[PDB]
UniProtKB/Swiss-Prot annotation, chain A:
This is Dynamin-1. It is linked to Developmental and epileptic encephalopathy 31A: An autosomal dominant epileptic encephalopathy, a heterogeneous group of severe early-onset epilepsies characterized by refractory seizures, neurodevelopmental impairment, and poor prognosis. Development is normal prior to seizure onset, after which cognitive and motor delays become apparent. Developmental and epileptic encephalopathy 31B: A form of epileptic encephalopathy, a heterogeneous group of severe early-onset epilepsies characterized by refractory seizures, neurodevelopmental impairment, and poor prognosis. Development is normal prior to seizure onset, after which cognitive and motor delays become apparent. DEE31B is an autosomal recessive form with onset in the first months of life. Phosphorylated by CDK5 leading to synaptic vesicle endocytosis (SVE) activation. Coiled coil: none annotated. Disulfide bonds: none annotated. Catalyzes the hydrolysis of GTP and utilizes this energy to mediate vesicle scission and participates in many forms of endocytosis, such as clathrin-mediated endocytosis or synaptic vesicle endocytosis as well as rapid endocytosis (RE). Associates to the membrane, through lipid binding, and self-assembles into rings and stacks of interconnected rings through oligomerization to form a helical polymer around the vesicle membrane leading to constriction of invaginated coated pits around their necks. It comes from Homo sapiens (Human). The chain holds residues 449 to 495 of 864 of the full protein.
Amino acid sequence: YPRLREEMERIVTTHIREREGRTKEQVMLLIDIELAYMNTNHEDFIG
Amino acid sequence: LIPLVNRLQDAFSAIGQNADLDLPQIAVVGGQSAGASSVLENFVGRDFLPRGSGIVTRRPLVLQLVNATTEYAEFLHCKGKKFTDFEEVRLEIEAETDRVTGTNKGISPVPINLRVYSPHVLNLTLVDLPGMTKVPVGDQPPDIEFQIRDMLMQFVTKENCLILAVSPANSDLANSDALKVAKEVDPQGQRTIGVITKLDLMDEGTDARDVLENKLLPLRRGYIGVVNRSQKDIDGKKDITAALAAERKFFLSHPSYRHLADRMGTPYLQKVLNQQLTNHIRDTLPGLR
Ligand SMILES: Nc1nc2c(ncn2[C@@H]2O[C@H](COP(=O)(O)OP(=O)(O)O)[C@@H](O)[C@H]2O)c(=O)[nH]1
Ligand SMILES: [Mg+2]
């Protein structure tokens, strides 16, 4: 049903796009968190 | 009024950098003397393309629109010259065609690059291709048919490309080479739109009502009927406004098209292409935003 296949694929891909915008924030924020503090208490030479 | 997708290009022009819409390429395909170059002319709204009976389009013309505050044209040859009179553009197109192809009806694959700046032209790219023929004439080698097809198969065989199949109304639809190519490269009818050009020349006692209603050869997106300026009028220098008024009178008057009047004409074709283009950005807007 060309109309139904067109709409269904448009909707599911627009949603996957709106989610890329949220998946990439938490990756930036996890690296920022990695830079905020230096934890030398485990699995290190000193620890 | 300005449609929203045009208002976006105005806004991105105001920003001036680092943002733009991704639109498809538009290709117009048809048989010789079908009326393709009068379709591009009507669509753009400026009478700058060479037109008339016989072989005229001898090279691929890659017309590239650009949004700008002032109206003018330019070529990627003759660098730096700004053409504010489109008659000069038309003569330059003819001269550039002759410099490469020669004057004895030659055909060459090297494209002509033209760029037009204007207020509300999004960034749409249009391509004009040199018709299709069966029998060589003039200084044309025997295998010209395959070379012309090979030229077509470099544009219509790509995705992200709309196709307008142009076919005359006074020639039975079964003979159209436009539909044959569209069907071969787009079997599902996803991109193809059909244009019927010469509805005013139908032999007395016949019409194309059966084709305009998408019954005879069903095509997904239907058929749109247009009436352009005859050879006398283009030689008589009739203005586009008069041509549009005549087209509206014709469709409103013809008994077999009264009930289809609201789906026929150049402006409707513009609406159809605006909706078609608006629907190729829907899944990209979240990224822009
Ligand atoms: N009467 C009439 N003539 C048309 C119409 N459309 C195209 N033509 C004629 O077709 C001729 C050649 O068309 P053209 O633009 O060259 O098609 P091309 O060969 O693909 O470029 C033009 O001189 C027009 O006079 C139409 O709707 N009505
Ligand atoms: Mg032509």
